[PDB]
């Protein structure tokens, strides 16, 4: 019933964010399948202008079957709309709502022994703003937009003057979507911070708080600084488009590059906002399945703080080819490099946690170990990109795309799956089948590596981002990347099957703690699921 959606309890809200993040995730993943269908071979076969002559429903279905090149007039606008849709959904409406809104809301209050959160009503509102934001983002796809078609083909970061000159109101709807997401995030952040500070259990001091609750706390601070800045950048776009301002228009004395400084001031923090809760989940999972307490608890906390702080002073590594002076370029390069040090401490500590342990290779542990390896692959290509002299070649190529999918889709997402398998028994009272979790892991592991690893080669060969079509010489690794994406998709549909099976007929969970004693945080002292009124 709709007693779910009006609930103010942090557990119910957490669950709502998780399911919704998952459903939007499915939509955004489906976009990538269509994207990879078109990138599978050179020449445009799917995104034909001819399909615009049909209706909405009929045009959709025709666009799923390939045409001969001679019958397919390339529609670049649709490509641009799809990738913009994919990025915006992921960055604002999928992973953060799942990690922060979902696990954060469900588990942080449990980890610190809080019976309730500071502002339950504000928490419920934060969810509704998330849903309204998602609705507007999706609506933008069907609204009058660029080039006399539907939707905004402007990239998920909305660079002007392109974003400010795009016709129709699709772009305005997208901007409102992002405002609503920011509002949801800010409310959540205020809620998290106040709860963490004022509602810890008696005895629960700062140095006894579990690493996950810390990850959420640090993340909440990043949000309060980063999201208001974004709200400014995009309101300036809105007024350039609608209210006669010229902040980013050179004829009125504006500077498009100003937008970039403001956008990336949010845009870098955004990724650390994404990844920090995944770091927290990895810490809980590895300690549990290594049967060993987390190595270097205090350095783990401080490394996260240092990453959070450093993530505010590196933004212009996204702007090395945008006209930055040599001095600015050198600084941002050196500052970015520093981030490797505290991240390395966390990676080595996770390995040290395993060292001398008694390792159980259950599904959550597989995701965690995959995370260590794959996040490292992504992190070191980030370090390559920090080098302005090499970024000169890689910028706006698929080498960047490979970087960020390794850290996000093989990093933060592996953290999401680790949490789901780790905690689904606790949240639902039903356990997932172990063989299916392992199968999911291996399919995703093979599929996502096949999708993204070959993108390094495409980037080294000079393949640009945001292209509907590409020179014939890029065909081989595009083909492999697409097959990888199809296998990953299959693994995700299998996962959805595993979740459905688990929730409808999974083995009944009878134990408060169905793992082992080294799952030593407060949620494991409660029933599965926890009672309505906790602690």
């Amino acid at each position: 019933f709709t007693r779910w959606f009006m609930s103010t309890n942090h557990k119910d809200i957490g669950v709502l964010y998780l399911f919704t993040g998952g459903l939007v995730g499915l939509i955004s993943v489906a976009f990538t399948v269509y994207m990879r269908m078109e990138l599978m071979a050179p020449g445009v076969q799917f995104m034909c202008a001819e399909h615009l002559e049909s209706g909405l429903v009929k045009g959709f279905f025709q666009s799923l079957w390939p045409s001969a090149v001679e019958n397919c007039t390339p529609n670049g606008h649709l490509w641009n709309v799809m990738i913009t849709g994919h990025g915006i959904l992921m960055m604002f409406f999928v992973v953060i709502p799942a990690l922060f809104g979902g696990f954060g809301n469900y588990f942080m209050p449990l980890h610190i022994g809080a019976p309730a959160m500071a502002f339950p009503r504000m928490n419920n509102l934060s969810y509704w703003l998330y849903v309204a934001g998602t609705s507007l983002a999706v609506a933008s796809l069907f609204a009058p937009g660029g080039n006399g078609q539907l939707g905004s083909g402007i990239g998920w970061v909305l660079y002007p003057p392109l974003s400010t000159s795009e016709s129709g109101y699709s772009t305005d709807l997208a901007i409102f979507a992002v405002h609503l997401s920011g509002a949801s995030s800010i409310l959540g952040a205020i809620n998290m911070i106040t709860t963490f500070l004022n509602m810890r259990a008696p005895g629960m001091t700062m140095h006894k708080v579990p690493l996950f609750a810390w990850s959420i706390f640090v993340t909440a601070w990043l949000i309060l600084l980063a999201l208001p800045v974004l709200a400014g950048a995009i309101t300036m776009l809105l007024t350039d488009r609608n209210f006669g301002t010229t902040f980013f228009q050179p004829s009125g004395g504006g500077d498009p590059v100003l937008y970039q400084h403001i956008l990336w001031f949010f845009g870098h923090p955004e990724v650390y906002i994404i990844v920090l809760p995944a770091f927290g989940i990895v810490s809980h999972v590895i300690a549990t399945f290594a049967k060993k307490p987390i190595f270097g608890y205090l350095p783990m906390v401080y490394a996260m703080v240092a990453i959070g702080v450093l993530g505010f002073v590196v933004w212009a590594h996204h702007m090395y080819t945008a006209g930055l002076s040599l001095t600015q370029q050198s600084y941002f390069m050196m500052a970015t490099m520093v981030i490797a040090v505290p991240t390395g401490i966390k990676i080595f500590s996770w390995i040290a946690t395993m060292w001398g342990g008694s390792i159980e290779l259950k599904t959550p542990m597989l995701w965690a170990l995959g995370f260590l390896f794959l996040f490292t692959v992504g992190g070191v290509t980030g370090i390559v990109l920090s080098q302005a002299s090499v970024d000169r070649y890689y910028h706006d190529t698929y080498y960047v795309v490979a970087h960020f999918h390794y850290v996000m889709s093989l990093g933060a997402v592996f953290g999401i799956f680790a949490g789901i398998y780790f905690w689904i028994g606790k949240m639902s009272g039903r356990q997932y089948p172990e063989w299916a979790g392992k199968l999911h892991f291996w399919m995703m592991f093979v599929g996502a590596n096949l999708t993204f690893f070959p993108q390094h080669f495409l980037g080294r060969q000079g393949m640009p981002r945001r292209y509907i079509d590409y020179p014939e010489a890029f065909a081989t690794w595009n083909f492999v990347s697409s097959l990888g994406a199809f296998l990953s998709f299959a693994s995700f549909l299998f996962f959805l099957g595993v979740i459905f099976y688990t929730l409808t007929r999974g083995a009944r969970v009878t134990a408060n703690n169905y793992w082992n004693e080294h799952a030593d945080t407060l949620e494991w002292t409660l029933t599965s699921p926890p009672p309505e009124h906790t602690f």
């Binding site: 090149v69 641009n80 081989t476």
Partner: protein
């Protein structure tokens, strides 16, 4: 002329270098690649070993340590050293890229939706460059018999579709070329991988890059900032030629 600056089928490396800057990028990237591959292999082997050595069947009672000071010192300092070392080789390469030398040849390039305009201020030459197969050349951004014919006529082949333009930026070999880059409408980005150059073309701003080509031939780039519907369809062709062939091309443009 030999087609040199282009992707090759199944390629996994950089495009060929045709400038000292590109050569520097290839060395620096190669150096960093060895390092990050060593780090990744190291990390991967540690994980696989730990899982083998400390699997619950083989190590039945877990240890309880949460510190190892010497190891914690080493694993903080060693990364710092590695990074300082990369920085030390990397910043000089950066300084060489971004310090604009005295020009032998000056070209002003303007990005438009969706084509490039070139002006040679010293020579009073200007012209526009469109993709072979764009609406400007009679196409609609796809291969056809007509497009293949135009590619053939312009000295290319079917394989150069999406890269080849109707007119090329022509420059002399072993001379310092300074390109001034701006945008006319939205942000575009002008690049040639073989020269190791890329510079955004921002409306209202004039930015500079340089290259000196070390061999003759044909070199391709593609617009590298999303700029709307035909972002995928406004590439860059540079022809590097002898000093004499360059002068000949100039004279062909001179109006008497």
């Amino acid at each position: 002329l030999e087609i040199i600056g282009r992707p090759q089928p199944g390629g996994t490396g950089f495009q060929p270098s045709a400038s000292p800057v590109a050569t520097q990028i290839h060395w620096l990237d190669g150096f960093i690649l060895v390092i990050i591959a060593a780090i990744t292999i190291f990390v991967t082997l540690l994980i696989l070993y730990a899982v083998w050595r400390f699997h619950e069947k083989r190590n039945k009672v877990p240890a309880r340590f949460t510190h190892n000071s010497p190891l914690e010192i080493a694993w903080t300092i060693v990364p710092i050293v590695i990074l300082v070392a990369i920085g030390a080789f990397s910043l000089p390469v950066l300084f060489n890229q971004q310090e604009i030398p005295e020009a032998d040849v000056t070209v002003k390039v303007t990005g438009y939706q969706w084509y490039w305009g070139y002006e040679y201020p010293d020579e009073e030459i200007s012209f526009e460059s469109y993709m072979i197969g764009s609406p400007a050349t009679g196409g609609d951004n796809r291969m056809s018999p007509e497009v293949e014919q135009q590619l053939i006529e312009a000295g290319y082949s079917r394989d150069e579709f999406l890269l080849a333009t109707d007119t090329a930026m022509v420059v002399p070999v072993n001379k310092t070329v300074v390109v001034q880059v701006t945008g006319a409408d939205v942000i575009h980005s002008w690049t040639v991988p073989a020269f190791g150059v890329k510079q955004d073309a921002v409306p209202g701003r004039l930015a500079q890059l340089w290259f000196r080509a070390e061999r003759e031939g044909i070199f391709f780039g593609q617009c590298s900032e999303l700029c709307g519907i035909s972002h995928a369809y406004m590439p860059i062709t540079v022809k590097v030629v002898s000093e004499e062939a360059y002068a000949a091309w100039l004279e062909q443009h001179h109006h008497h």
